[PDB]
């Protein structure tokens, strides 16, 4: 206890628990999905009984006029086919409002997140973030989004998305706010059937500053574990499409000479680049052990396998048999790994792959030159502040129900 954190919803031994110290009760009703790779993340449906109810400890229930408070969580909103969701209707997903609509509410709309704060007299203020339809690559749709709301009772209510302030409005006209004893995670009044992901729900008894919000955003998901495109944990022995951060409108294809090409423009559905295009890869542990999980971590030695078909994987290697500093990445039709290994690392949600020799010799980070995927030592000294820096950053796209394209 004694921390700014008065409520922290975390997973322990088959249930959700308050780890703050103030001992609020957390109950699951109906069918609530738990993410196997990270059970702190849960999915609620609206086509059946699926809710999470936090009975707050009486000691932490907000009933003041001047006490600052902050709320944080991550939300995941699939758009499915971008068509079934295309309806203008505000629907609730987190409810801490009393019978007189006093308290606070998190609601959604078409590509929109809304925060409502109302006092006992019915005076309210709403903050919103409309991320809109994908124009090329979307940073929000079916991705984990970090929502933070700060409330200074002598100033503004502020809404942060992924650590960035995008909306603020004065709440000086709001008097006594008495929130609900219960926090209900439940999709209410959505016109279509859908699910929603929630994780790392926190209530703080202060107004968080930009440094504290960016710290939560950086550290709440394990920095040691690599992320996929959606923001889940990167997994071993999982098929992934590839995205180059510097070339989001391009996908990777195979050539007949075993080289990998990047001069392939993505098709669009309206303005949204197709995600499920190009080659598939699988990450394989080098030093495999039945004690290790399937999570890909920083400095993991791995093999990157090209997926020719479901049952046919060929090692990707750096073709060093050339006079060029940069080495083209090749598919090995023989299954020979050419005494090479790949070291995984990450900067935020972006992944790097360092092709090295078994003797420890650096060959280079995976990037591109002209129209070909290469390994280059250039990136080592230009990870930042250069126009071409992000050419060594990759996202791993998993084909999932939440993002459909025909």
């Amino acid at each position, epitope marked *: 206890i004694k921390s700014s954190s008065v409520l922290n919803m975390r997973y322990k031994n088959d249930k959700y628990v308050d780890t703050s110290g103030y001992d609020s009760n957390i109950n699951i009703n109906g069918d609530v999905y738990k993410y196997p790779t990270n059970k702190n993340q849960f999915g609620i449906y609206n086509d059946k009984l699926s809710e999470v109810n936090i009975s707050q400890n009486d000691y932490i229930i907000y009933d003041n006029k001047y006490k600052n408070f902050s709320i944080s969580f991550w939300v995941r909103i699939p758009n499915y086919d971008n068509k079934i969701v295309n309806v203008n209707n505000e629907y609730t997903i987190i409810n801490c409002m009393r019978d007189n609509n006093s308290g606070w509410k998190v609601s959604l709309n078409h590509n929109e997140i809304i925060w409502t704060l109302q006092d006992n007299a019915g005076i309210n203020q709403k903050l919103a973030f409309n991320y809109g339809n994908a124009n090329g690559i979307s940073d929000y749709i079916n991705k984990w989004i970090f929502v933070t709301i700060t409330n200074d009772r002598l100033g503004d209510s502020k809404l942060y998305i992924n650590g960035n302030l995008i909306d603020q409005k004065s709440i000086l006209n709001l008097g006594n706010i008495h929130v609900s004893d219960n926090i209900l995670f439940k999709i209410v009044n959505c016109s279509y059937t859908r699910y929603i992901g929630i994780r790392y729900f926190n209530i703080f008894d202060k107004e968080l500053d930009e440094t504290e919000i960016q710290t939560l955003y950086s550290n709440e998901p394990n920095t040691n574990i690599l992320k996929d495109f959606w923001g889940n944990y990167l997994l071993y022995d999982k098929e992934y499409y590839l995205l180059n951060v510097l*070339k989001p409108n391009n996908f990777i294809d195979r050539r007949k000479d075993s080289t990998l090409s990047i001069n392939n423009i993505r098709s669009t559905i309206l303005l949204a680049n197709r995600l499920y295009s190009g080659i598939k890869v699988k990450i394989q542990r080098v030093n495999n052990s039945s004690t290790n999980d399937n999570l890909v971590r920083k400095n993991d030695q791995v093999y990157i396998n090209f997926v020719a078909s479901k049952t046919h994987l060929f090692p990707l290697y750096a073709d060093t048999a050339t*006079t*060029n500093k*940069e080495k*083209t990445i090749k598919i090995s039709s023989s299954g020979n790994r050419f005494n090479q290994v790949v070291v995984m690392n990450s900067v935020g949600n972006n992944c790097t792959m360092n092709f090295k020799n078994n003797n420890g010799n650096n060959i280079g980070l995976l990037g591109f*030159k*002209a129209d070909t995927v290469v390994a*280059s030592t*250039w990136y080592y000294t230009h990870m930042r502040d250069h*126009t071409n820096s992000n050419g060594c950053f990759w996202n791993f796209i998993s084909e999932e129900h939440g993002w459909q394209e025909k």
Partner: nanobody
Framework: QLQLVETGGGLVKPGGSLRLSCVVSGFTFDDYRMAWVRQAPGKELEWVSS????????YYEDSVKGRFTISTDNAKNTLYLQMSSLKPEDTAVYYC??????????????????????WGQGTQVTVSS
């Protein structure tokens, strides 16, 4: 529509001056570093010069600097190589090439085809007494 056509290559006396023109189609010079690459009769390709036009930057193979002068013209959409003081062993087939600016900006002395996004057909340059 992506294409590069080179013109201006011929036979000029040792110490002459030639003006190669690479007329490109399908892309802008603000998205592609441009390069002249020579091929000797039977030898491997040799990078001659490159230009970055978005911010005027020239790169010359040591044996080339001061004599030749690479230039671009977004007006007429044409890459130029102003050759001058031509020596006997500058005789080769001269290709223009376009490299994606966003890729690894290294300059290999003896490139292969994957060093550049797009190549031309090449113009012969002979220089004999």
């Amino acid at each position: 529509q992506l294409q590069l056509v080179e013109t201006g290559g011929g036979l000029v006396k040792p110490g002459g001056s030639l003006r190669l023109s690479c007329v490109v189609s399908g892309f802008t010079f603000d998205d592609y570093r441009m390069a002249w690459v020579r091929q000797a009769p039977g030898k491997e390709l040799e990078w001659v010069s490159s230009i970055d036009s978005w911010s005027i930057n020239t790169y010359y193979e040591d044996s080339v600097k001061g004599r030749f002068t690479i230039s671009t013209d977004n007006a007429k959409n044409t890459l130029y190589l102003q050759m001058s003081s031509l020596k006997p062993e500058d005789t080769a087939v001269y290709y223009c090439a376009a490299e994606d600016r966003l890729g690894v900006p290294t300059i290999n002395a003896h490139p292969s085809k994957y060093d550049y996004n797009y190549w031309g057909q090449g113009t012969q340059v002979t220089v004999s007494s």
